[PDB]
Structures are given as C-alpha cells and as structure tokens.
C-alpha cells in the first residue's frame, strides 16, 4: 500500500558458547526506526532515526522489556522445535519472526502479517484473513492447534488491525519531513568500450528513495530484455538507494537504445539516452 | 512499536 | 493455580511480615496488589521475569522478592505507615495480560 | 486522571431489567479490554475478555467496545441477585508494556 511498518526478529542458537543470539528491528517504509542486539553493550531498545527520539521514557522502557521478553520466548521455541523434529543440541540452529501492517492512501488498514520460520524455511504464518493459519509441516500443526487453542489469531489481529496502523498514522505525522518525502533519481548513463565491435551501456540511478524503482532498456522504442543485465538494488548508506542496468549494443548504433526509469518521485518514467 | 510479548511454538 | 496464605493475618506494629504467593500456571510476570474498603486496586510490585521486580505506585515500606519463577514473597517492613490492607496477588503470561488473582489475604496490623 | 476510569459510585438497577457498566480509557497503545467481577471480601474473577469493535456476546452477559471513543461497557441482562458486585475495568498498555486497572463500579440489583 501507501505506507507500512514492519517489525523482523531473528534468534540464533549458540549451543555450547552462550544464551542465543536475538537481534530485532523495526522499519517505517524503507526507513529503520528502531533496533536491539543482545550482543550490544546498551542492552535496550535504541532509536535509528530522529523523529523517533523524541519518544518519552515509558516508550524505551516498554519496548526494551518487551523485546526481552521475545527473545525469551525465542529460547524456548529454540528448544521446544527440537523435540518437535527430533533434532540435536549440537547444532545451531535460527528462528525467525516478522510482522507487520500495510495501509492504504487514507492511512488506514489495508493488509496485514504475521509469519515465523525454522532454519530459514516457512514453519508457520498467518493468512491474509487474520482468522487462519497455514502450517508448514507436522511440527507447525502442533503448533497451529496449540495457537487455536489460545485464540491466538484474535489476538495478533487486534495489533495489526489496531495498534499497528495507528502508531504508523503516529509515526507518520511526527515524521514527515523524512517518510513522507519521495526523491527522485539521479540518473547519468556511461560507456564502456567491450571490443571493437561491442560496447556496453550503464544506466544509472542514484540517490532514490523509496527504493521501488524499475529499469527497462529498449531498442528503437520496443523493449529488449535479451543481452541486458539487472543489479539488485542496494542502499547507499544516507538512506537512499542505488541501481543500475546495463546492455551490450554493436558498435555505432548506441542511438537506437534508451534507458527507461519507473519511480514513485516521477509522474513520467524519464529517459536516458547516450547522444 | 511492538505487539505484546509472543506466543510459544 | 495461585495460592496465598494465609487468608487471615494477624500481626504486631514493629515486626515484618512475610506475604506468600505462589502459582504454577508457568507465568512470568507476577503482581503484588492492596486493596482498601471502599477503594480499588493499587500496585505495590511486579516481576518480569525471574530475579527481578519494579516499584509500584505504593512500593514505599514494602519489598519482594524473586528468587524462582512460582513464588512471590512480599515482605511488610515496619516502615509502611498503613499496613492494614486486602493484599492480593496475580499472575500473567506478560506485562499486557489478562492478569488472574489469588484467593487474596487480609492483613490487619493493631498497636 | 488516570488511565481507567469509571464511575465508582454505586448503581442500581431493578432485577430482571438491563444493567450497563461503562468505562472511558485514555489510549496507550490500548489493544485488550476485560472486565471482573469482585463480590465483597472475594478477589476479582475474570468474566469477560474483548479484542475488537463491537458486542461480544457471553450467556447474560455483552461486552461493547468502541476504540474510537474509547469506550469500553458491559450489559447485564437479566439482572439477577447474583450479579450485586463491585466490576473492575482493566486496559492494557502495549506503551510501556502495562496492565491497568480501574477503580470499580459497585452494582447492586434492588428486588
């Protein structure tokens, strides 16, 4: 949708060298907010972005004993799906939890999830009715008929539904001037001579935010996808994010190829051209 | 901020 | 499920008194409640998890105590100034629970 | 103010009519909802819990909550003579990871 908050927790079993590993953090959009690592020396929730600063102390102190309390929580799953599987305490292994809320253009709900993983594979997620669940394997549905049991799905619907999009529509407000900004991309295009017959084009795309972008190349207006290659887009590091495209063209005719760039900073896709 | 402590598996 | 004794106590001003709880429904967090005629609940003290607690909003001239995660001793030092009081003990799976209560102890405490 | 709030001031309702119990809460990340039942020299029993806008409907009993309002209420029907007691409002906190309590309402049904 419009907007969304989104929450990622991940715990890795040290076995024999210490408690777990629980590192958690919270992103608004493409933006982190908050963060918590048990190997960190403050031992507390802490602020990564400055709109969130201003928060009082009972934010802090609340959420500190709440991520706490997950990674708990975490160490018990930790040994409780090793019985479930029938598995070693020699080995590590991870368990991962995300959720989240997404709201559309009148920042109201829209979509919502809640999802949890053993060893980087689905265990167990909440459908998108917010009622239901879906179970991976046998050891998921002893959970799902335990979770059942628990009206637990009423429960986390009441946050996704509820306190997550109003503390978004908070976030938001108190935010404005860093999430509801939009920067369009900086783009330039250069040349590579490959060989005397075969020359490459980048183009590139810098400095955007959020990171949704699309690049497209094309040959005299049609779209060509053969001989073209694609990055994954990375963040640049100031909270914006970087990508290009390439395509390998015969020497001379680099006129006959534009560069197209989709971003939500720009009502028209710009094009980009070499001469 | 975070939904309340989770359930275990 | 959760216990307190003894239901009626009877005590001397200048001693301290010992306020057991305990429960067995594998709850993290427990709560140390009093309660006046005529009036509602107040917190006294409350435990995340095992050795730990935090004051509450009255917690001057008591103290607790966590040792292992089902029992809960709350202590009344002489320096709480009205410790005639309905004391009443709850537990929870969190800090944003439905808390459930103890059968609770009437403490009277004469000169 | 505080956090829960409610009228504490006792009400009567004739038996057999409609009983209704209302409380007003000031937000703090407010998710869950309930409501006791304490009857005198007893501690409070948990009878009705709510999640989501709406009536939720348990036997006699109808919880209402209102988000938007913040308004949390209970309707009683039947009033019977059972139903004489003091009926706590409790809210919780997902700001701060709370549990908080209201004063009471006391209720007795007149014959």
């Known amino acids: 949708g419009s907007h969304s908050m989104r929450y990622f927790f991940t715990s890795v079993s040290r076995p024999g060298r210490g408690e777990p590993r629980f590192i958690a953090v919270g992103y608004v959009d493409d933006t982190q907010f908050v963060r918590f690592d048990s190997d960190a020396a403050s031992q507390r929730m802490e602020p990564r972005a400055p709109w969130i600063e201003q928060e009082g102390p009972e934010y802090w102190d609340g959420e500190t004993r709440k991520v706490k309390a997950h990674s708990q929580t975490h160490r018990v799953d930790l040994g409780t799906l090793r019985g479930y599987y029938n598995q070693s305490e020699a080995g590590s292994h991870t368990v991962q939890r995300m959720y989240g809320c997404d709201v559309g253009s009148d920042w109201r709900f829209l979509r919502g999830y809640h999802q949890y993983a053993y060893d980087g594979k689905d265990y167990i997620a909440l459908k998108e009715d917010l009622r239901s669940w879906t179970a991976a394997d046998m050891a998921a549905q002893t959970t799902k008929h335990k979770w059942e049991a628990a009206h637990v799905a009423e429960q986390l619907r009441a946050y996704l539904e509820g306190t997550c999009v109003e503390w978004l529509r908070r976030y938001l407000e108190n935010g404005k001037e860093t999430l509801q900004r939009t920067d369009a991309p900086k783009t330039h295009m250069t040349h590579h001579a490959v060989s005397d017959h075969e020359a490459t084009l980048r183009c590139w795309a810098l400095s955007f935010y959020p990171a949704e972008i699309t690049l497209t190349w094309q040959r005299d207006g049609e779209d060509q996808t053969q001989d073209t290659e694609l990055v994954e887009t990375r963040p640049a590091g100031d909270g914006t994010f970087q990508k290009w495209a390439a395509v390998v063209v015969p020497s001379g005719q680099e006129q006959r190829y534009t560069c197209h760039v989709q971003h939500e900073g720009l009502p028209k896709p710009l094009t980009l051209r070499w001469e | 901020i975070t939904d309340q402590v989770p359930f275990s598996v | 499920g959760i216990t307190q004794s003894p239901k009626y106590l009877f005590r001397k001003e200048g001693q301290n008194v010992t306020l057991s709880c305990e429960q067995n429904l594998n709850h993290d967090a427990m709560y140390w409640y009093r309660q006046d005629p005529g009036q509602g609940l107040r917190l006294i003290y409350y435990?995340?998890?095992?050795?730990?607690?935090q004051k509450g909003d009255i917690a001057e001239g008591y103290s607790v105590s966590r040792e292992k995660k089902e029992s809960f001793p709350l202590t009344v030092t002489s320096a709480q100034k009205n410790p005639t009081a309905f004391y009443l003990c709850?537990?929870?799976?969190?800090?944003?629970?439905?808390?459930?209560f103890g059968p609770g102890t009437r403490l009277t405490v004469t000169e | 103010q505080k956090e829960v709030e409610q009228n504490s001031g006792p009400l009567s309702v004739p038996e057999g009519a409609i009983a209704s119990l209302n409380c007003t809460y000031s937000?703090?990340?407010?998710?869950?909802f309930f409501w006791y039942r304490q009857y005198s020299g007893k501690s409070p029993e948990l009878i009705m819990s709510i999640y989501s806008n709406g009536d939720k409907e348990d036997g006699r009993f109808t919880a209402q909550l209102n988000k938007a309002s913040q308004y949390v209420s209970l309707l009683i029907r039947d009033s019977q003579p059972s139903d004489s007691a003091t009926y706590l409002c409790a809210v919780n906190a997902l700001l701060g990871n709370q549990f908080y309590f209201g004063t009471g309402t006391s209720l007795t049904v007149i014959p």
């Open positions: 709850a537990s929870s799976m969190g800090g944003t629970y439905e808390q459930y």
């Open positions: 937000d703090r990340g407010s998710q869950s």
């Open positions: 435990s995340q998890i095992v050795n730990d607690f």
